[PDB]
């Protein structure tokens, strides 16, 4: 399978993608690119680095002035988060690895919604009180997940940060936290002392926490982590973190382990996750309301005593409602204890932050079909009554496959997108009529049709007529496509006229 699709290769690696107002924004090393939605042509670029950072040089100003090199270090600016806000005047909000993890806001001029250079504001207020706090230090260079949400008429950021112990009295980052933007737009605020839950300094180095994904649902906020099973355990697992969606602080904070298995082969390391509604057929199969949010997560086996993915993959689905039932009804005390890395192990306590002991289990929905492969990306969408997943591998391979408990399915779309691993940062857009996903691989991003690609595989009318029926392929005068893409009045699944 070889296809030519709308694509874009950046000057550097791409970290994040965001779709706004029919323009595509790329968070990449040292650049933010603005692409056209139609053809993915570059409309503009914004140079974010490299920047010269230093002890003396201060956040949210250029010290290129005194690039004197007294102690100057050039650093590439990796995009850690990229957010659009339309609650305040439309803005792109971008946070990079350098300058204490501060964010910058690019305010679009009234008629030019692709201009991120005219008005750029660096978000920073000097900590007013006598404070060791840095609400403006948002994002960690080790890895961060930013979930943005409007609540109570404020823009709130929920953030997951991987941390070490190389940190300051100012410039402390938090593992997990909620903070809000000030209406003045010149800074962020932690509301209470419970707005952040941090790994004890004592463990910051030995207990890394990676944040795979984050989402809202059911009035709750959810993060997905990878981390050690225990403070001093040599093994790793995936956890789902739940807390109340409030800005005043993190409430009802609970962590829960997630086992994805195959039938007892544990796939203990989540690679990518996507939450969406289930198609009709699948909903019935899994006891869901067409209404219900489903967490689809591709898991991988780790090498012994490691968090390194081993090239064996599974995909388990977790109905939020299902997940919630376990969070909501404690059952055995034996399964619950004080959050081990937040309080110590020997805390008096051992609000009250909690972790579960046993893992919540699901069963590979692809029936071991991806055991010899490493899935690195996943998005999910409905087509008619079907649920379809868009998978990517460590090898640059892209697949579309139908999701069902009733039998396995060979992907109806499967091809090599690139040499580079498929990025987990994906976008799904439903142009009502039709739809595409944006998939990243290295420095390239590709625009893939959600539906008609199965057909484009067939080069001739004959091949096209002998396509498997569920793809709904047909011949429009010189090409194989689904009914809806035929502008030559006449589309056929029955007749090939003379060549």
């Amino acid at each position: 399978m070889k296809y030519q699709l709308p694509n874009f290769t950046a000057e550097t690696p791409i970290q994040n993608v965001i779709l706004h107002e029919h323009h595509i924004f790329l968070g990449a090393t040292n650049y933010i690119y603005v692409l056209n939605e139609e053809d993915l042509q570059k409309v503009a670029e914004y140079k974010t680095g490299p920047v010269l950072e230093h002890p003396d040089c201060f956040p949210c100003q250029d010290c290129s002035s005194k690039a004197n090199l007294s102690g100057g270090v050039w650093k590439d600016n990796i995009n850690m988060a990229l957010v659009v806000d339309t609650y305040y005047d439309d803005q792109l909000i971008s946070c990079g690895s350098v300058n204490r993890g501060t964010c910058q806001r690019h305010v679009f001029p009234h008629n030019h919604t692709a201009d991120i250079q005219s008005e750029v504001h660096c978000i920073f207020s000097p900590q007013i009180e006598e404070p060791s706090q840095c609400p403006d230090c948002v994002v960690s260079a080790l890895g961060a997940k930013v979930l943005s949400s409007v609540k109570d008429r404020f823009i709130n950021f929920f953030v997951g940060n991987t941390i070490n112990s190389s940190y300051f009295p100012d410039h402390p980052l938090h593992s997990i936290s909620v903070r809000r933007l000030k209406e003045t737009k010149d800074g962020f605020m932690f509301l209470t002392d419970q707005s952040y839950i941090d790994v004890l300094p004592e463990f910051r180095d030995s207990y890394p926490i990676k944040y795979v994904h984050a989402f809202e649902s059911n009035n709750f906020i959810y993060f997905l982590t990878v981390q050690r099973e225990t403070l001093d355990a040599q093994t790793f697992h995936t956890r789902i973190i739940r807390f109340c969606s409030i800005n005043s602080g993190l409430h009802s904070y609970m962590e829960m382990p997630l086992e994805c298995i195959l039938t007892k082969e544990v796939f203990n390391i989540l690679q990518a996750a996507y939450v969406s509604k289930p198609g009709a057929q699948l909903a019935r199969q899994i006891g869901a309301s067409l209404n219900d949010d489903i967490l689809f997560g591709v898991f991988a086996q780790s090498k012994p005593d490691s968090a390194e993915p081993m090239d064996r993959s599974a995909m388990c689905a977790f109905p939020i409602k299902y997940v919630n039932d376990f969070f909501n009804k404690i059952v055995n005390k034996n399964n619950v204890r004080c959050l081990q890395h937040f309080y110590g192990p020997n805390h008096e306590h051992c609000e009250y932050r909690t972790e579960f002991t046993t893992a919540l289990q699901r069963v590979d929905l692809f029936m071991g079909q991806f055991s010899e492969v490493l899935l690195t990306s996943i998005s999910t969408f409905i087509k008619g009554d079907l649920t379809i997943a868009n998978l990517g591998t460590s090898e640059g391979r892209f697949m579309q496959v139908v999701v069902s408990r009733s039998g396995p399915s060979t992907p109806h779309v499967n091809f090599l997108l690139d040499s580079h691993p498929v990025s987990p940062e994906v976008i799904v857009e439903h142009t009502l009529n039709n739809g595409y996903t944006l998939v990243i691989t290295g420095k390239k991003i590709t625009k893939i049709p959600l539906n008609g690609l199965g057909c484009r595989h067939f080069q001739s009318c004959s091949q096209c007529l002998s396509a498997p029926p569920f793809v709904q392929c047909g011949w429009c005068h010189d090409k194989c496509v689904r009914s809806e893409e035929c502008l030559s009045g006449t589309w056929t699944q029955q007749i090939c006229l003379p060549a």
Partner: antibody, heavy 119, light 114 residues
Framework: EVQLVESGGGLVQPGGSLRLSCAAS????????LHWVRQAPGKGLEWVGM????????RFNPNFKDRFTISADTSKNTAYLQMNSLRAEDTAVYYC????????????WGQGTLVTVSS | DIQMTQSPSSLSASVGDRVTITCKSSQSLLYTSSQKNYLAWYQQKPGKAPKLLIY???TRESGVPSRFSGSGSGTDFTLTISSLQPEDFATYYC?????????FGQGTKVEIKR
């Protein structure tokens, strides 16, 4: 032909517990959710819950989430509705049910047993 | 819940008459991807399981006499029974199976004038 038969109906004190049986035949038991519905004499229909025989997953009308339980035995192609802290308004006819596919709600039903919660 | 409101609770009509039962839901039962409404109509004879008449709002089930017809979209649905027959005395229930818990309408008692 799909066939569903309830059992265990009868008289039960308020406060007490009762286990209803639903033995199924004529389809792959593990491939369909097994639903329970009830109806108080001369009243409307109320949906109780359902279990997935393949893994024993459950879904309950928020009303019975606390007091009710559903179990299954794959070897017996039978589902059990377990009720506790039964009270007057639980006196009703209890049907078990299932469907042909995702296109329909319930296609097949039992005869229903009568549960009377009295002293 | 999703609340189901049937109207009327009772009606008494003659053999051969067109009867109309109404069913309103508190939110859309429309599944947009296939453009199907997840609403169904049951018929219940005394001391009997409910029998499925119509599913997806307007699709008549196999066997069901031609005179039963569903219609409506979104929040408003209608079960019509033209040419009412004597064996049609029963209680008709609209049910949504769009989300859990599944919910029925109060049911409409249908009696035959004669």
């Amino acid at each position: 032909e799909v066939q569903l038969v309830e059992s265990g109906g009868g008289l039960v004190q308020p406060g007490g517990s009762l286990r209803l049986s639903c033995a199924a035949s004529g389809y792959t038991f593990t491939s369909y959710w097994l639903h329970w519905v009830r109806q108080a004499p001369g009243k409307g229909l109320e949906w109780v819950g359902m279990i997935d025989p393949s893994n024993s997953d459950t879904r309950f009308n928020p009303n019975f989430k606390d007091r009710f339980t559903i179990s299954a035995d794959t070897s017996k192609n039978t589902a059990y509705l377990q009720m506790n802290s039964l009270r007057a308004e639980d006196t009703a006819v209890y049907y078990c049910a299932t469907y042909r596919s995702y296109v329909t709600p319930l296609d097949y039903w039992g005869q229903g047993t009568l549960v009377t919660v009295s002293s | 819940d999703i609340q189901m409101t049937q109207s009327p609770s009772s009606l008494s009509a003659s053999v051969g008459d067109r009867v109309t039962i109404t069913c309103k839901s508190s939110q859309s039962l429309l599944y947009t991807s296939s453009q199907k409404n997840y609403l169904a109509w049951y018929q219940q004879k005394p001391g009997k399981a409910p029998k499925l008449l119509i599913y997806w709002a307007s699709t008549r089930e196999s066997g069901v006499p031609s005179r039963f017809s569903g219609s409506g979209s979104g929040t408003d649905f209608t079960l019509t029974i033209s040419s009412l027959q004597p064996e049609d005395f029963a209680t008709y229930y609209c049910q949504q199976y769009y989300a859990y818990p599944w919910t029925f309408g109060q049911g409409t008692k249908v009696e035959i004038k004669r």
